[PDB]
CSV table of C-alpha atoms in Angstrom, one decimal:
chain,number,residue,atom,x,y,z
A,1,UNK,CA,113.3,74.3,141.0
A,2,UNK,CA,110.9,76.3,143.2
A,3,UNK,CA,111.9,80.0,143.1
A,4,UNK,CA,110.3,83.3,142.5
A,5,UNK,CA,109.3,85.4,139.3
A,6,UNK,CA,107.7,88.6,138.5
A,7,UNK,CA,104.8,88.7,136.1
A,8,UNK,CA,102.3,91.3,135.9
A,9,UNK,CA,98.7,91.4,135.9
A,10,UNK,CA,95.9,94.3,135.2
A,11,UNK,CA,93.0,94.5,137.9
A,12,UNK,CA,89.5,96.2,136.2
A,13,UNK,CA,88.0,97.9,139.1
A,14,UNK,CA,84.3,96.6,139.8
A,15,UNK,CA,81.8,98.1,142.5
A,16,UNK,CA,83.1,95.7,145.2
A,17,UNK,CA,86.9,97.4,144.9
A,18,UNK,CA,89.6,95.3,143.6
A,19,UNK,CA,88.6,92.8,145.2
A,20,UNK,CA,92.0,92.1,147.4
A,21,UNK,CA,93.6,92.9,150.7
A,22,UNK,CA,96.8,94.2,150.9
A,23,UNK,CA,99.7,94.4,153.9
A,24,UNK,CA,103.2,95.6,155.2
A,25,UNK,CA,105.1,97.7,153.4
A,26,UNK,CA,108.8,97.6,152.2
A,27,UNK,CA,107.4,95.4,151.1
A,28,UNK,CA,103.8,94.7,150.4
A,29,UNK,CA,101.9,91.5,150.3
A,30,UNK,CA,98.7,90.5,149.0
A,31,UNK,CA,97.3,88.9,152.2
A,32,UNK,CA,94.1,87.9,150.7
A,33,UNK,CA,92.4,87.9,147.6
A,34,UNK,CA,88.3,88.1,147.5
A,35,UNK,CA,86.3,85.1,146.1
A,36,UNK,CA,84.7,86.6,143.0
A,37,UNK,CA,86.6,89.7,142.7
A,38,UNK,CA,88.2,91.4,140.4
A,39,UNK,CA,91.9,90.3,141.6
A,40,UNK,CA,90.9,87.3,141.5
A,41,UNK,CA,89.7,87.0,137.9
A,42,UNK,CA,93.1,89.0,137.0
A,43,UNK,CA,95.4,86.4,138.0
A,44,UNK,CA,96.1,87.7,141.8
A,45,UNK,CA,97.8,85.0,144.3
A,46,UNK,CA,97.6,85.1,148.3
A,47,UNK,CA,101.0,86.0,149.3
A,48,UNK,CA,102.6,87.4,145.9
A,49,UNK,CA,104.6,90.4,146.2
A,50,UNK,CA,103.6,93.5,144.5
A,51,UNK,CA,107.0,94.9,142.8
A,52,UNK,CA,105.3,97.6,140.8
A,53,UNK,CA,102.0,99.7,140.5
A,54,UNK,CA,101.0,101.7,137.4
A,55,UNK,CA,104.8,101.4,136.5
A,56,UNK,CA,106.0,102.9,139.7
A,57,UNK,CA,108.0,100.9,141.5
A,58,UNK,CA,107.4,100.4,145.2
A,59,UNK,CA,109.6,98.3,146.5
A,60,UNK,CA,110.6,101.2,148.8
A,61,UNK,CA,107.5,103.2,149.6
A,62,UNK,CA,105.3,102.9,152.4
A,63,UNK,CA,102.0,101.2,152.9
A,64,UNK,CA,99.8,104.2,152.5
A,65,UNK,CA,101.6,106.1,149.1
A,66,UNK,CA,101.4,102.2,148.1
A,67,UNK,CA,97.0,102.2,148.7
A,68,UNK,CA,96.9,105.7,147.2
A,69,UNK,CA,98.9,104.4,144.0
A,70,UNK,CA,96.4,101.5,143.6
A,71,UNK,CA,93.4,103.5,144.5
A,72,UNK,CA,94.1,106.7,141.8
A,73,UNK,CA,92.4,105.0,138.5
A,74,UNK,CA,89.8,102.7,137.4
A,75,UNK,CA,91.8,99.8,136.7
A,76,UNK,CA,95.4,99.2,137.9
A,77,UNK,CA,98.5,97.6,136.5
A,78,UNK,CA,100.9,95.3,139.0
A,79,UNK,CA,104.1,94.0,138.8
A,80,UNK,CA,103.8,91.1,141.3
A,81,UNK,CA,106.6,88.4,142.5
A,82,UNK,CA,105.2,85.1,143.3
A,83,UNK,CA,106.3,81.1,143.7
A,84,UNK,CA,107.3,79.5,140.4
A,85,UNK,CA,108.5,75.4,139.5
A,86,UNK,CA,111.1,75.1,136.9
A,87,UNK,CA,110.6,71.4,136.1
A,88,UNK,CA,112.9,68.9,134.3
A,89,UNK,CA,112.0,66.5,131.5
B,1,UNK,CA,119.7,90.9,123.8
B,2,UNK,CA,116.0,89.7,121.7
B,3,UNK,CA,113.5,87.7,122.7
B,4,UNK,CA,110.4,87.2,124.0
B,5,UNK,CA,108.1,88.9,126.7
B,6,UNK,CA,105.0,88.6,128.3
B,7,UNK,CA,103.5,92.2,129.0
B,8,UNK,CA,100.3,94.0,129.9
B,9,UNK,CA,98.8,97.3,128.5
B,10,UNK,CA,95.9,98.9,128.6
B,11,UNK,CA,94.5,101.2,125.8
B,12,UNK,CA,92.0,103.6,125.7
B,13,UNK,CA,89.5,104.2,122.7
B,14,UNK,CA,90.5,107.3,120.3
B,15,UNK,CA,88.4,109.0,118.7
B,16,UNK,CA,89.3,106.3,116.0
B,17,UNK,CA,88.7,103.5,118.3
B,18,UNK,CA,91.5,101.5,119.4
B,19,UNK,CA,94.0,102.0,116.7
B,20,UNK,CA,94.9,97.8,115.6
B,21,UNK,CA,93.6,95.4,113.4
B,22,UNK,CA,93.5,91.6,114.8
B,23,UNK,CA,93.7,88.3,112.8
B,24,UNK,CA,92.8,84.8,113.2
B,25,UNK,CA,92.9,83.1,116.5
B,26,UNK,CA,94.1,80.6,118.7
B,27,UNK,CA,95.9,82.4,119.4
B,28,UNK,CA,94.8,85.8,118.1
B,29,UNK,CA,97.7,88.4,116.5
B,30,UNK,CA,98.1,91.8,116.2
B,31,UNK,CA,98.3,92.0,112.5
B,32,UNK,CA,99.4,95.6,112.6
B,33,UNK,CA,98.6,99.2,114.5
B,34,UNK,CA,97.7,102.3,112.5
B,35,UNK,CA,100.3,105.4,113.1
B,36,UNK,CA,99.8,107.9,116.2
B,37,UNK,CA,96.9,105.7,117.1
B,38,UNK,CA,96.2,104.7,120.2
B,39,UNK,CA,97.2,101.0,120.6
B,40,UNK,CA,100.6,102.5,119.2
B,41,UNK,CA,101.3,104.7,121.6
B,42,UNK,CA,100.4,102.3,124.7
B,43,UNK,CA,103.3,100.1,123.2
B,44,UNK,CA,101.1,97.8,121.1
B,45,UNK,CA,103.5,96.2,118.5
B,46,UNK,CA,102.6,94.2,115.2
B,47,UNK,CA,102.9,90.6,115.9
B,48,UNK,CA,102.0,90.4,119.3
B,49,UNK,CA,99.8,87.5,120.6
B,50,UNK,CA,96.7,88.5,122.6
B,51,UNK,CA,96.6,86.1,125.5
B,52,UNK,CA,94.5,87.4,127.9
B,53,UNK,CA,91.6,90.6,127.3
B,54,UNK,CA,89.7,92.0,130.2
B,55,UNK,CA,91.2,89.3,132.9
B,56,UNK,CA,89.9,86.8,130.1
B,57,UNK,CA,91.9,84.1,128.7
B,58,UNK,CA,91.0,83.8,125.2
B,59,UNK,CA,94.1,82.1,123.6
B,60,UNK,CA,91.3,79.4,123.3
B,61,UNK,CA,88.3,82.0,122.0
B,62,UNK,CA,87.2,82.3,118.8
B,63,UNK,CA,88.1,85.5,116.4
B,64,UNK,CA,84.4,86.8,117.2
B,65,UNK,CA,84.9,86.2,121.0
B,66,UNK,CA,88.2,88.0,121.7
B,67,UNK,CA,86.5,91.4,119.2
B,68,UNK,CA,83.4,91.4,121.4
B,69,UNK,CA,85.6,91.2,124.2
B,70,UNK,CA,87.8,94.2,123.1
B,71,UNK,CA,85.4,96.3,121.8
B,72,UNK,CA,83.0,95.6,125.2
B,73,UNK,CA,84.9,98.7,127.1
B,74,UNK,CA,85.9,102.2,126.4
B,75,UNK,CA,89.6,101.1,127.2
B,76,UNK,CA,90.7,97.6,127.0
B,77,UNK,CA,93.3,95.3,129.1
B,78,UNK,CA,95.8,93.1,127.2
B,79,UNK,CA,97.9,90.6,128.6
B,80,UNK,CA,99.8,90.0,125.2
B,81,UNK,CA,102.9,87.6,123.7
B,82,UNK,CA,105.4,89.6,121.8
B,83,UNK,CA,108.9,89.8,120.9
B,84,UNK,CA,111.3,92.2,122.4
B,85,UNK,CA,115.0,93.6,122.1
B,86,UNK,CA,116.9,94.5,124.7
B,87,UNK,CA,120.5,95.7,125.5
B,88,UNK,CA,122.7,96.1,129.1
B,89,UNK,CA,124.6,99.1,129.0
């Protein structure tokens, strides 16, 4: 009924950063998301789980290789696991 | 073993622009991708729905909307519908 899912999500770069907040490693959270921002706007969630960046999985890797994967383009591609309701009718 | 996926890409502008042709909306298809182009190779397949361009949802924008919206950017974010295949082996 209430479990967890993996969906992915794009962030375009603005001039204020992605706009989110990022912590841990092995794995990493997103510990905050900025009002406005560009995460925000792509779908980003407080306390989702980022799988994959760019394709690379990271499940594994530590916080910093994590930031530098993020950081190396204009835009970047997730793979995020986050709370999801399965509901019956 | 087929289905359907949810999925994003990002494409960047050939020298022939984005290499797809969209039609109708609500939601908005890919009615087919030229050969070699560049929506090809960034996995764009004919019959995929556009649901989201640039962090925007436009399964509820009008055929005018969702081109400006593509054709705003040198490359473009899709968060697109499609069918898939798929085998364990």
């Amino acid at each position: 009924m209430t479990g967890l899912v993996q969906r992915c999500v794009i962030i375009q770069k603005d001039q204020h950063g992605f706009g989110f907040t990022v912590s841990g490693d092995r794995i990493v959270l997103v510990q905050s998301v900025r009002p406005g921002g560009a995460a925000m706007k792509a779908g980003v969630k407080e306390g989702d789980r980022i799988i994959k960046v760019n394709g690379t999985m990271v499940t594994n890797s530590s916080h910093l290789e994590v930031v530098k994967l993020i950081k190396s383009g204009a835009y970047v591609a997730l793979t995020l696991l986050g709370s999801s309701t399965s509901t019956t009718l």
